[PDB]
Nucleic acid binder design. Structure first.
Ligand code: NA
Ligand code: NA
Length: 327
DNA sequence: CATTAGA
DNA sequence: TCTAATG
């Protein structure tokens, strides 16, 4: 957690670079299992050889660990950190819609900068267009203050469209959080579940409602169950307009709402931990259901959930407010 | 780990 | 269809 800090830090810098800059899946997959285990290690790594005794650590990484142990730096790391090209890839990538794949391509074409991007908006598809368009706003965190405003809006229209709809703002926002990266709305309706063959309109209707009143201002992607777009708070009695914020709404079969809601609320850790608990308690939990575990090894049979409570009860735990779903 | 776009 | 990109 800190005893192995720079080493795992370096290890991860390395990993990242294989993946994005080069296309070295393996190498990259390498650096990471390494960084995974040396991080688990209970003692201060004093040398290569020592590290070396670990699973995943090879001659390769070892060598690296020595140089870094020996001197506060690594050359390769020093070179990459300099390198224009690899620098560029790191940057473009920050643009929603721009992955490494495209990052690479643009670069080799000569688009390195943000400006570069503009002069060639034409080489970009929609997503990247918006991504570029709202680059600055997309990077800004979302105040809880704002979040409450946003939330207030969505729940409102959603209702007006159908009073039978159930929506939930999941994420850190849900768990207290003073800020947030983007709004996630979990949605379901009673006429939509595991069997009942869809009703795409169900998503569509609300997306529409939202655009109608000007909340959603762009669409990154609209499918029949997942909409990914852009929103914005009505810039009041002017002098101050709001940022463009990413937003995603997802339709869920009423019959899996809670797991889904559980899950999305996180935290990444509470999950696992909650996840690990249900196992002993003779169960299984994933994004959608909860299945009693059978002896033969595994087993199935989706248990009936009407609230986040049902889940807890099931596994006989303490209903934990979201606020405290921190770990 | 799954869904949407794209070409 | 495969492949990319967010989540
Ligand atoms: Na080893
Ligand atoms: Na990006």
């Amino acid at each position: 957690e800190t005893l192995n800090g720079g080493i795992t830090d370096m290890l991860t810098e390395l990993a990242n670079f294989e993946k994005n800059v080069s296309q070295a899946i393996h190498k990259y997959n390498a650096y990471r299992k390494a960084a995974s285990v040396i991080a688990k290690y209970p003692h201060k790594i004093k040398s290569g050889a020592e590290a070396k005794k670990l699973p995943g650590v090879g001659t390769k990484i070892a060598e690296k660990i020595d140089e870094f142990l020996a001197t506060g730096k690594l050359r390769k790391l020093e070179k990459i950190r300099q390198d224009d090209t690899s620098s560029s890839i790191n940057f473009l990538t920050r643009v929603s819609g721009i992955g490494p794949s495209a990052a690479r391509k643009f670069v080799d074409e000569g688009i390195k900068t943000l400006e570069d991007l503009r002069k060639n908006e034409d080489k970009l598809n929609h997503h990247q267009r918006i991504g570029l368009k709202y680059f600055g706003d997309f990077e800004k965190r979302i105040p809880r203050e704002e979040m409450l405003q946003m939330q207030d809006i969505v729940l409102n229209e959603v209702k007006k469209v159908d009073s039978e709809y159930i929506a939930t703002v999941c994420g850190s926002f849900r768990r207290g959080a003073e800020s947030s990266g983007d709004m996630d709305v979990l949605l379901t309706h009673p006429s939509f579940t595991s069997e009942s063959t869809k009703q795409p309109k169900l998503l569509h209707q609300v997306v529409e409602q939202l655009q109608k009143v000007h909340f959603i201002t762009d669409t990154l992607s609209k499918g029949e169950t997942k909409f990914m777009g852009v929103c914005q708070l009505p810039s009041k009695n002017d002098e101050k307009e709001y940022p463009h914020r990413r937003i995603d709404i997802r339709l869920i079969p009423k019959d899996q709402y809670y797991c889904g809601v559980l899950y999305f609320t996180g935290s990444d850790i509470f999950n696992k931990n909650m996840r690990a608990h249900a196992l002993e308690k003779g169960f299984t939990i994933n994004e959608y259901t909860i299945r009693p575990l059978g002896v033969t090894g595994v087993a199935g049979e989706p248990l009936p959930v009407d609230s986040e409570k049902d889940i807890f009860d099931y596994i006989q735990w303490k209903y934990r407010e979201p606020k405290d779903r921190s770990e």
